[PDB]
Amino acid sequence: GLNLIAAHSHIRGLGVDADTLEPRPSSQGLVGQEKARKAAAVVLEMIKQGKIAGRAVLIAGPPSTGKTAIAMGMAQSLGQDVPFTTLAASEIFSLEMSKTEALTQAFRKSIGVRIKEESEIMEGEVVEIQIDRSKQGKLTIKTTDMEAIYDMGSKMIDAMTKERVMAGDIISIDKSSGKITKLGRSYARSRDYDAMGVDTKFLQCPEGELQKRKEVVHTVSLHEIDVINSRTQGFLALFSGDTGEIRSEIRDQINTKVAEWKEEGKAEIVPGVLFIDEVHMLDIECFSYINRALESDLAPIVIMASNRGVSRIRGTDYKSPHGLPLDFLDRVVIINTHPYTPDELRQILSIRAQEEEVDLTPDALALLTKIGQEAGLRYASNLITTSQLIAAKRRAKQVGVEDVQRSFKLFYDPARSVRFVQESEKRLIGNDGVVDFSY
Amino acid sequence: GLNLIAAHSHIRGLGVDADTLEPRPSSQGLVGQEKARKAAAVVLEMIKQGKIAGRAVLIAGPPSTGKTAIAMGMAQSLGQDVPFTTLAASEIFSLEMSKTEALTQAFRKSIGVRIKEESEIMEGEVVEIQIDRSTGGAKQGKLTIKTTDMEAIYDMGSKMIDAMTKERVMAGDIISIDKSSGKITKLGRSYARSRDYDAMGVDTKFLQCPEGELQKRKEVVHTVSLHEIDVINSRTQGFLALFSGDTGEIRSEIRDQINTKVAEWKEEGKAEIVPGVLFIDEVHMLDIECFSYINRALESDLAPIVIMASNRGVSRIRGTDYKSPHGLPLDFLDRVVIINTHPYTPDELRQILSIRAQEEEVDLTPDALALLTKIGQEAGLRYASNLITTSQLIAAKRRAKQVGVEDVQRSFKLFYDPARSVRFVQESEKRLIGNDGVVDFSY
Amino acid sequence: RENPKAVAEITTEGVLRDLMNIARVKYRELGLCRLEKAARPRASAPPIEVVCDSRSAVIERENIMFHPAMR
Amino acid sequence: HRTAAHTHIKGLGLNSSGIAEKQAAGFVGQCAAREACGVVVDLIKAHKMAGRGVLLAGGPGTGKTALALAISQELGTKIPFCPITGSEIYSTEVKKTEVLMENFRRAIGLRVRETKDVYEGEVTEMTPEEAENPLGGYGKTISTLLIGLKSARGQKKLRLDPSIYEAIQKERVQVGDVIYIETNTGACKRVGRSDAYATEFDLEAEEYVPIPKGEVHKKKEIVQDVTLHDLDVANARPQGGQDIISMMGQLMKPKMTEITDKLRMEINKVVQKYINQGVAELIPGVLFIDEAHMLDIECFTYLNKALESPIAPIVVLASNRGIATIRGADDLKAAHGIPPDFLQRLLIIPTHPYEPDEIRRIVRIRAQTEGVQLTDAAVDRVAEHGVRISLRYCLQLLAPASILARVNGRTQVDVQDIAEAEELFLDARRSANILTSTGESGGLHGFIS
Amino acid sequence: HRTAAHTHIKGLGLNSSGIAEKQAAGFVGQCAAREACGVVVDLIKAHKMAGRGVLLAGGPGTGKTALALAISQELGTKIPFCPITGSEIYSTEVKKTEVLMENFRRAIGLRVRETKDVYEGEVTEMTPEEASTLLIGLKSARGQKKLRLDPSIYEAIQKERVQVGDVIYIETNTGACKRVGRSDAYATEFDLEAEEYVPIPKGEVHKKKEIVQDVTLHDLDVANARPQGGQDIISMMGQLMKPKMTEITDKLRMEINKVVQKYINQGVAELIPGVLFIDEAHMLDIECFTYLNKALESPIAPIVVLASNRGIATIRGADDLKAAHGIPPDFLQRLLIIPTHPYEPDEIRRIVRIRAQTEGVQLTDAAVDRVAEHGVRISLRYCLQLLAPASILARVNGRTQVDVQDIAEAEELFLDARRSANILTSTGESGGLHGFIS
Amino acid sequence: CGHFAETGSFLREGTNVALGYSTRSLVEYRLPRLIWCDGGRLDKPGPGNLVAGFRSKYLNHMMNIWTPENI
């Protein structure tokens, strides 16, 4: 389909016993990281129970230690039912709005408002419109399964006139609003005309009863209600962006009304998760805002990931662990992800090969595990796709060691690349611009 | 006219033997710089030949060594046949668009699409217009037109009668009509009808009648740049942004579509592509992001030749903190051949001053030209050239017909050269505000 | 559904109604709407136009630059 | 009427021979600089030259700006004098090189004959005529208006195009109004009601105006002064048509735009037609860039190309700085704060400090300019400042001393009133001593560093 | 046709087995790097994989951009190849992470095979059928045809000022129509009218032709983000009204992916993921690589090829961090890295000969020798730039071919940056009247 | 700063006269019909511009998320 195979496609959940939260050595695509997965499962429990507002959890560890994979597994195991905003810290440096607005919006995205509704919608093919003046009229609609005649009021005949409803059109009438919509024309009329206008499309005739009373559940972000109230047709801004630094007094009204809906039982508030990847790319002004943002009843749980050691915070010149302010880190609990043993690498490379539908020979998987130990998980992972293609070029049935070896010959790992950069430094643009182009 | 006398007004071309590319010792207003003028003529040849795309040439040399002069000489020796864009590198630091977008538009301006089209134009003196206007209007009407060689009468369609009334076309008016559009341009009033123009003031001009046939096909050769086609396609009056500015960053997929369509028109033979020149004056005002873009913009098939000038030595590249020749990064300079301009000898200064004394209406006495030449060696070509204008104004104050040594001496006394200006600064350091902000106002 | 602007227009003591019109009232009370103009543009021009020797261009000029539905 | 720093300057005070009179037109001294500024005035009045550069070079308070404003008076009112500081160039709307070009073209003037071709009369009939369009959804449209105009010596019936009816309609014209119509622009003005039926009992506060004398149709001619920049702005933000773009362009917020070279070049063609038609005189003027050291190296590098333009004003720079760092080019130091390759383009008029007797003369010129009648011992007192203190500090004391004398009931300023002015109103140096002595240590009562 | 820098590069020149031929398709050498690029071509054409990164790493002038344009030609015109420089993303309109998103989606293609039914003819009849439907009669030199028109296509025909005797173009399926003109059978309806008269169409009144249309996912974004073209006439005002880029929400891009997959399931559209190539990736900053890191994890992302010529260099936006290639080591782990090495003197000779015959220049053997000498001692790019000037100089000497004389003249008219730097060092020795500005 | 049609005679004008909108720009952008009419405008469908007709239908309707069937 349109979903291609990605880096985290094999991650299908968080892989824990739902009773004890004890992880198992592999399941749902994840391997190892047992304590981090158990901690992630404990966070997922308080996400799903929802009463604990505004906790912050940092996933800290070296590159290629499953910090993003665990965040994906937590999102998969949380399901579609609960909001899971996934934000790269780079996304907050908007030109169209301030960083604190951009953080506010991401916070607002992560709280759902859930509403359940039944409403009467009449949908069908128009058979005839009949009109009398002396205003009244009659409408004949069919499904595949019914035909009926409806009396139309004066305003309803006007709406039909304004919207140019013909016979053979498919129309919907929401009885709750009274508004007509034209969905198209019935495909039976495909021969009715030789040429058709640009805005015309054919449909199958509606099926079953003419007017239906489906029960539907709706979950909308607080961010959506904001942007809808931002301006007269603000819902269009939900797609184009095209929204300002929304006034705080609008959000003040919306929070007050959403509380009324929860008191009256019109809605259920569904607090979800914000995951900020590479949170060390935020600056001192983001972090100091997030402190106050977390300390509110409508704050989600915030997960975040960093691979930085002791490193300078952005927007300042002093260093700190993870690249984060200690004033901020005091509000955080930290999950640490470790490197992988060769046996855990061997499993992950098998899971990747299965997800990529690559049949490794046992020796190739062994050699590929050595490369994963010597050159890193991502490099050995990327050699799987490469060796499959090289094997296909020789029409091989299985990826042999010779296909991994040629993959290793053709594509350098980071360490071998850094060595190449050091070995050829005069042929390459230095940090001071010097280079020699000659032989 | 509206063109005044300006620093380059004497440059009429490159001054090179078109049969051999041998530079003549002086011609067309250029003096010396022979090797540089030969090189610029070889560039000029391959510009006209078109077959070579996206080469970049730097003209490098000390100030006042004729780098702009050679650039203006190439522009004057290309003329209208080839697009010629001049860009000061300061110009791309727009607030409307990113500097790589501004630099893209400059490359797009330098490729012409040449489109040849015909229309029947009808032109002559109006002998009569009858329009009945029968409550409504434009019902029916007849037009009589003559040249010196023919006369004809025409029944007009109603939307032509609107055009005639819109242009208030009158007996004796000399008009052209483009038939397919139906626009009417009044080229003038015929002299024989002058007395009928009782409302026209005495300042009014008159013309003789048009000559030959009333109707002929006139063929127009349009040249439109790729930038104009890009901007036209941006919005419902996109061309209107070619004047006001207020183009945004034009979307890349619009340009990519246009490149394909222009390749179709070329293959269909409907249009020709005419590669021009982009001249980037003082290119060292660009920064390291700009040079990285230029490196690959030059590799496009629809790239002009780019010509550049730099005053700079080994100098700090903008947007970074290290130094390179010309102030240009070495990776960019690898893509560039360099033409050097040298300092002038005293006789070449004498000739350039003589040329500048012809371009302004100045008579120099032989001793005044010798003194200005001496000042030219000592104080620079530009300063002595500005003493020419000053001396003529002093001579005119004393009502002299020719500029004498006395006038040049007054000029040298009244207006300091750069070195004496620096010496004045180096003496006045307590009265002039220093780099420390310190200054003493006491006597 | 919840906005003071609607309520302030129905209450008979127009207090908040006037507090919301301060700017438009005083602008008018200063006479700036009646004071002579102290400047105007020294030049004025109509829009630049494409000139194309075709009838479709003339129609499309009338459709856009003299757009009937906007007009 | 109000008195300002340069109110005493009236001109350069030169002889017909172009030598400076040692005290004339408000100046004292600077004679060599005033003579150089005279030759620059000659360069400007002789239209022949474009893009020559002049630098007034000299310490603060040496009269560089007085020289520039004296040039502005010797040129008179006809020639455009366009003063700016280098700090005006940093716009938030458009690139700083746009502002330079706008100022370059504001410094070139045009005087142009214009024929206004107009209809004027009392509206005596107004009758619209319309068509039922095909189903475009906006409904019927007025096809034309028939309007009757009455003047004192004629009448017309006009069948208007509907774009002129929209001018008539947005002008809120009625039958019985007096109106003016330009066939140039299609624009309409409601002049008033007729003086017929001018009954007092209208709340409408109408201006009743007499019937236009003469014929309904008129073809008056008037002479307009405009700059090239006025034409650029008119054509970049079109507003004189009755089309929808011109209409909406009056409702939108006005904003500056980075007018293209393409537009400016084609306006050169348009203006040169006016010259060849004999309806326009081109009158190039001067751009005075005060505080030119506040320009940056991008401004200066643009000025290279801008001055090479085949039309450009004369540019007069002023700078007050020694060897100083070029702004935007912290690697580069040069004299005057001007890039060394740009300085090559200019003629430099160095400007020198005043002598103590010149200061005495300036103090007396300035005192009588402000109307401060001032005793000779009081003049000597004020003129001992300017030597020991800046010249500006002298001139600034004259107004406090006048107030204090008048408050003391004196008709004229004595030495006492200056000696009180000296005490109430310090110079920078005495205040700088107060800082260094009081801020000699930190504390509750210290000055903040 | 014109000859740009790479116009001799026809492809990767790989064997059937994917081994590189030592000189083929206009490459010389880089065999190991051409073979590695061959596997990248296979990766792309398989269209199985999202978001794999590739890095081309090596000195300037080592052919990194030849290789990327060889890939682009191995993929052919079908597969979208989207080239940018890393400096192009610093837009003033929107955050640079939005600019990256727009370029990722330009690299994913969507192909629709549309049958166009065109009726072009003189309007012989226009009969309003209802009071909705129109019947129109169209005529060519070869017959006439009646058509039943839906009220929508009727009002399009009626919004254009079509009348009987006009010549029109109609697309039956799309509903597009154009007034081609007035038929010249009416050319004497008046002696003058403001009208354009065209011959009657002389072919069939009906034509059917099949056009394989290509769009991209970014085209679908732009069309869905805002009214485009004739939908938005007030755009003519500029300022607030012009079609600015806006920071598209991933709500929109997710909802576009839904609709696009619907038409893939109907079999109407074919998805074609392609390539985003970023040259001078060292011009990307730390925030861009931070975004790329996430964006490459999305299920749609194209294959990304990067080039860099930096050694160990500071990453932009974090001068505290120095890394190889100027690429953060965090992100470098994600990339398949292909090294490009310098050329031998004999390889320089062969490239000179390849480009000579591509510019149409022809050389003596000693002329090849002297140019190749400049390639070894100065730069490959310099010696190739000698070829065109030397041809002009030979031409104006009347010679049919370039010889040593014409190169020895070209090399003195047109200096390299190295000899130019020597001139700057000798002449800019002081800030004198004839010195270079420091 | 624009063109308009001058009245050449008052005596010959008469009492009933049609006032056309003559106002035009003196800046005057000549374009070939190949660009302005025959498919150099990418959005204008016709012969030659075979893309615009397809692209208009599919991007604005068929594959457009706001069409009611997609919504």
Ligand SMILES: Nc1ncnc2c1ncn2[C@@H]1O[C@H](COP(=O)(O)OP(=O)(O)O)[C@@H](O)[C@H]1O
């Ligand atoms: N425990 C695991 N089980 C299976 N796959 C994993 C595991 N940890 C990491 N991976 C995979 O290895 C790659 C790198 O891990 P990732 O978490 O994305 O890196 P980082 O540690 O920088 O977040 C991804 O493709 C991820 O799916």
Ligand SMILES: Nc1ncnc2c1ncn2[C@@H]1O[C@H](COP(=O)(O)OP(=O)(O)O)[C@@H](O)[C@H]1O
């Ligand atoms: N070889 C030459 N022949 C004629 N005029 C010249 C020549 N070289 C310079 N000039 C003139 O002298 C002035 C300064 O030269 P210019 O080309 O501006 O030098 P640069 O651009 O390198 O500062 C210009 O007015 C130019 O026209």
Ligand SMILES: Nc1ncnc2c1ncn2[C@@H]1O[C@H](COP(=O)(O)OP(=O)(O)O)[C@@H](O)[C@H]1O
């Ligand atoms: N030669 C002079 N004659 C008369 N007044 C002068 C003279 N020079 C300067 N002034 C006056 O002294 C004051 C300061 O001079 P100013 O022009 O401001 O110096 P600058 O502009 O160089 O700082 C101004 O009021 C000016 O009119």
Ligand SMILES: Nc1ncnc2c1ncn2[C@@H]1O[C@H](COP(=O)(O)OP(=O)(O)O)[C@@H](O)[C@H]1O
């Ligand atoms: N292997 C090769 N075979 C033939 N020609 C080459 C080869 N490599 C480079 N070239 C040519 O030399 C030029 C310089 O290489 P280029 O790819 O621009 O270097 P880079 O992009 O790495 O700086 C290219 O434009 C190309 O025309």
